[PDB]
């Protein structure tokens, strides 16, 4: 799946307009919480490197790190969900438009299938 050549794709569009039809990630999304945790860890390591009280040196700096991480994570998650939605839409459309390549398998019950039995001895 190389989607660079997809027809009707704006070159440098981070989030296309049709992505607005997808549900946005919730503000309490676990991945957003993880990005905020990453920002908090970045703040702690920043305090540790510059030889400052790790937990309580700069509250504004740690808050800025967490907020920026959450912002970028929200937009990145939006783009991720949009790209996966595009992949699924393309796969379903291709399956619909090529019936001969995806035949409907005849439903068969185990009572009429013969599976070889290997005893455990």
């Amino acid at each position: 799946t190389m989607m660079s050549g997809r027809p009707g794709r704006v070159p440098l569009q981070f989030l296309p307009n049709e992505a607005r039809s997808l549900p946005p990630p919730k503000l309490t999304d676990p991945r957003l919480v993880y990005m905020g945790f990453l920002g908090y860890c970045s703040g702690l390591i920043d305090n540790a490197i510059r030889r400052r009280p790790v937990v309580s040196a700069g509250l504004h700096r740690q808050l800025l790190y967490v907020t920026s991480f959450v912002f970028f994570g929200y937009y990145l998650l939006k783009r991720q969900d949009y790209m996966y939605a595009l992949r699924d839409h393309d796969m379903f459309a291709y399956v619909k438009s090529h019936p001969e390549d995806f035949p409907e398998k005849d439903k068969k019950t185990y009572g009429e299938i013969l599976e070889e039995f290997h005893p455990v001895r």
Binding site: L38, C41, S42, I45, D46, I49, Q80, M83, R87
Partner: protein, 347 residues
């Protein structure tokens, strides 16, 4: 040099890379490569000494030869098809020569010999720039013409790069040579997935660039270029040694660290294409990179080496210049495994 001149040269390097990345005409790509080559030379020679001059002239020779091969490939492609657009290569070994030129530019085996020498000769900042920024343009071109490449040659050079990096890193006591061999092995890992998925190549590039930035900034902060010189860092900045050890473990590909994400994905991708033996061999060979990373970790933070008396004076001073992005680089190169599916963003 004059800071204005240095800023202008850095902007010229970046503008050459961007010209390579945004242009659709082969001549403009070659011109961007020429611009980057021209503006890179003084950066390698910011600190004037015979070592830096030797490194710069070796780099210039290799890159000029690569540019000449690139132009010959372009001209043969034009001869067999009157096209200048960067597309399918349209021809036999014209593509082979294009691949060889791009491999020499990237430093892939068997054209790996110049990377350790140039990295050892230049300082740590020049080495950082050389090993991080100078990979974007050739990899972008390779990603553009990936459907043209013969998989046999690309995979052969990738496996050679991995093997040579793994073996050559074992014998080094200098940190810059270790970084150069690490770069060679990582490029080998990157180019083995180009025939199958360029997104995985870009993901590996991003992860490797983050790890290399963190490692080089940690090495600059504790200004050591040798294993023993690095062994004295614990007596002043133990937290730096701990962060360095964690980053080295991440670069070794250990889960759950961030550096595990590319190889994993790459292996996964290569299994979708009915390829098993090469992923197995690549993992077993990256074990060597892990071994010499682990030796450096032993010498760095897991053991306390003897110190010197004058070290006491260094206890009384603090670094005047502080790197702002270092904390972020460490976190991104250490703790981004759970965000793996974000690679669908076509990074």
């Amino acid at each position: 040099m004059n800071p204005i001149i240095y800023t202008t040269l850095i902007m010229t390097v970046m503008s050459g890379t961007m010209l390579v990345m945004i242009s659709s005409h082969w001549l403009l790509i070659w011109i961007g490569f020429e611009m980057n080559l021209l503006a890179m030379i003084p950066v390698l020679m910011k600190n004037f000494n015979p070592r830096a001059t030797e490194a710069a002239t070796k780099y210039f020779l290799t890159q000029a030869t690569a540019s000449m091969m690139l132009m010959m490939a372009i001209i043969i492609n034009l001869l067999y098809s009157g096209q200048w657009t960067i597309t399918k290569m349209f021809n036999p070994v014209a593509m082979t020569m294009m691949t060889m030129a791009l491999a020499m530019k990237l430093g892939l085996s068997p054209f790996h010999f110049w990377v350790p020498e140039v990295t050892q000769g230049i300082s740590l900042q020049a080495g950082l720039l050389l090993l991080t920024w100078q990979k974007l343009a050739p990899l972008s071109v390779l990603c553009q013409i990936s459907q043209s490449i013969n998989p046999n040659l690309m995979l052969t050079m990738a496996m050679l790069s991995i093997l040579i990096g793994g073996w050559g890193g074992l014998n080094q006591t200098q940190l810059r040579k270790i970084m150069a061999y690490s770069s060679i092995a990582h490029m080998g890992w990157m180019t083995a997935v180009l025939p199958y998925n360029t997104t995985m190549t870009i993901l590996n590039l991003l992860i490797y660039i983050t790890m290399t930035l963190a490692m080089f900034m940690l090495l600059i902060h504790s200004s050591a270029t040798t294993t023993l010189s690095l062994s004295h860092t614990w007596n002043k900045m133990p937290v730096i040694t701990s962060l360095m050890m964690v980053t080295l473990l991440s670069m070794g590909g250990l889960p759950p660290l961030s550096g595990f994400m590319p190889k994993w994905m790459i292996i996964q991708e290569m299994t979708k294409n009915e390829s098993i033996i090469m992923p197995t061999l690549m993992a077993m060979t990256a074990l060597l990179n892990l071994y010499f990373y682990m030796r450096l970790a032993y010498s760095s933070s897991l053991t306390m080496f003897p110190s010197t008396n004058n070290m006491k004076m260094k206890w009384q001073f603090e670094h005047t210049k502080q790197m702002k992005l270092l904390p972020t680089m460490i976190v991104l190169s250490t703790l981004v495994l759970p965000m793996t599916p974000a690679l669908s963003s076509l990074n």
